[PDB]
Amino acid sequence: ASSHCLWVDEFAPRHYTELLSDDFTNRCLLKWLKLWDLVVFGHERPSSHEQVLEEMLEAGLDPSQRPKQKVALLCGPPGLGKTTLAHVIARHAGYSVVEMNASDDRSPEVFRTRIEAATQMESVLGAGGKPNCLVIDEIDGAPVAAINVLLSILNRKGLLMRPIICICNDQFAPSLRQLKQQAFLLHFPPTLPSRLVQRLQEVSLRQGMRADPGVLAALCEKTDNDIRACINTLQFLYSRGQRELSVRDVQATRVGLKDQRRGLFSVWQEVFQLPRASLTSASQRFYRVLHAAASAGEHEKVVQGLFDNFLRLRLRDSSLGAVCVALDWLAFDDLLAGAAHHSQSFQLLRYPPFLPVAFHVLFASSHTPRITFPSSQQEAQNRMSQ
């Protein structure tokens, strides 16, 4: 059934040796699942961010023959294979995958009975039945009470006897604060371009069509190290009319370009640091900074970070004119927020997106600034309330 399936599903990994993630993360998830064998399978033998994960794997066991980390949280951007690695590792270690998604009801009672059904009884087949591995995709979309139910069933001293894998897209969600102090925190780096280009070459060669690796590297840089977006874009651009991909088709913006939710630190880095050396025009940098700062979201946090980070730079304006007009711009934003929240005229919120591009124009430097998270306004408000 070659014409009945998507290319992401046809070329999907089924074994461990054809995964495309970072190798460390795969070893860490496999070694985390392989130490669960003492309590589940009843067998003693199975057969920086690096140092903390390598120390915590060999940290020993608590007096319940179970790991000190009871769930594993898989964080990263979309399109790397977190669900694929979780399913492949669970099927590799003899477990049976139980899928939790955002398409379920996810009410606290439904969450509680489904975790208690998945984890607290064995298989119906009896001997030879594979144990149940709970995989919870999109845990960041779950409510606060669902995470509270999960932590309540995590800390029963009715003990948890089965592993749980949690997959999220953003670790800094307010609903996953407590989970990060109890989970096996696995951070996903973006995929390497060499392995990605080689896998796209295998995908194109198995479909009998040619694409040189320059245009594949251009597609990799355009789609942000995304396997799913690049394979879908190759499926749209190939079709059956032509076999050789052109560079101008990928360099065109009409197909495969998606809006990317930029992080706060990436936005602050692009505002305070000039791009290293076409792209030297200042208007292009103006539009790029404005578009990515608008596409990041959470405008108040960006304003707080710009307020807390613009005085720590190596400022070349010794006359403090740039600092004065930056404070004028911040007061202009504050006046606009007050006028929008006072007169119920919310059409005044098109201008405070131009505050980060004003800070980028004022404080464009070629140095490497150390941007810290904003906290002075929040601690000031807490202290004032106290």
Binding site: A117, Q120, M121, E122, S123, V124, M161
Partner: protein, 258 residues
């Protein structure tokens, strides 16, 4: 072309409220011997095996082997408009996406033709569950549903231990402890209330309460329930129906025994 003319609509009514929340789907396997449903929970907890033979219906016609992947909640709105004493014509075409149910439920000539969109699932195969059960007993159905409701008042799990005197049911909770001891009740006029003991190697296991009560939802459907359980092998309740077929259930025990 497949046709199944069930002589009473009460028996197909009482099947489905037992397995309403229990299974998310119904897989009617269609054969010349009869209907077959080897359904399985996605969390590998409970298994439902249902088989009604061809001679128990008003008529039965089958051309070739067929399977009905059927949404179970979508079926349940048909039986809310069905009757207790009526003829039900469960029919389907050979290569089609529909499943029709024709009946005259309110006994007022009202020919109701309710169609159902089929759904396709993956073809998982469970051949034969092994039956080497050490402990088999027979119990009345109506007494089994009451004691499952009695232990549902206080606790959240039942410890079930078979013994030569009888099956012992125990539960614990913060409110209190519910416990009864089964005795030999064969000295009664009713033959269904008698408990028969043909067991050896007594075992003690723990089972969930939310799955045990819905096993006993179809207790007016059959008079006698056969309990089968042993070590490292799931508990079986068995609903031997009078004429058209039989129903059995499976239930994996809890990890934390006793």
């Amino acid at each position: 072309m497949f046709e199944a003319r069930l002589v009473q609509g009460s028996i197909l009514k009482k099947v489905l409220e037992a397995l309403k929340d229990l299974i998310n789907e119904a897989c009617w396997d269609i054969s010349s011997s009869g209907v077959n449903l080897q359904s399985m929970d996605s969390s590998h907890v409970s298994l439902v095996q249902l088989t009604l033979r061809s001679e128990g219906f008003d008529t039965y016609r089958c051309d070739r082997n067929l399977a009905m992947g059927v949404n179970l909640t979508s079926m349940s709105k048909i039986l809310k408009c069905a009757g207790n004493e009526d003829i039900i014509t469960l029919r389907a075409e050979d290569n089609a996406d529909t499943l029709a149910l024709v009946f005259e439920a309110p006994n007022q000539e009202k020919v109701s033709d309710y169609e159902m969109k089929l759904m396709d699932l993956d073809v998982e195969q469970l051949g034969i569950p092994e039956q080497e059960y050490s402990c088999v007993v027979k119990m009345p159905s109506g007494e089994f549903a009451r004691i499952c409701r009695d232990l549902s008042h206080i606790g959240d799990a039942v410890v079930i231990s078979c013994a030569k005197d009888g099956v012992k049911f125990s539960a614990s909770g913060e409110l209190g402890n519910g416990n009864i001891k089964l005795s030999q009740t064969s000295n009664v006029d009713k033959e269904e209330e008698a408990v028969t003991i043909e067991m050896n190697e007594p075992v003690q296991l723990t089972f969930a309460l939310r799955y045990l009560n819905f096993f006993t939802k179809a207790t007016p459907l059959s008079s006698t329930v056969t309990l089968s359980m042993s070590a490292d092998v799931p508990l079986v309740v068995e609903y031997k129906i009078a004429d058209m077929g039989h129903l059995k259930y499976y239930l994996a025990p809890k990890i934390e025994d006793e």
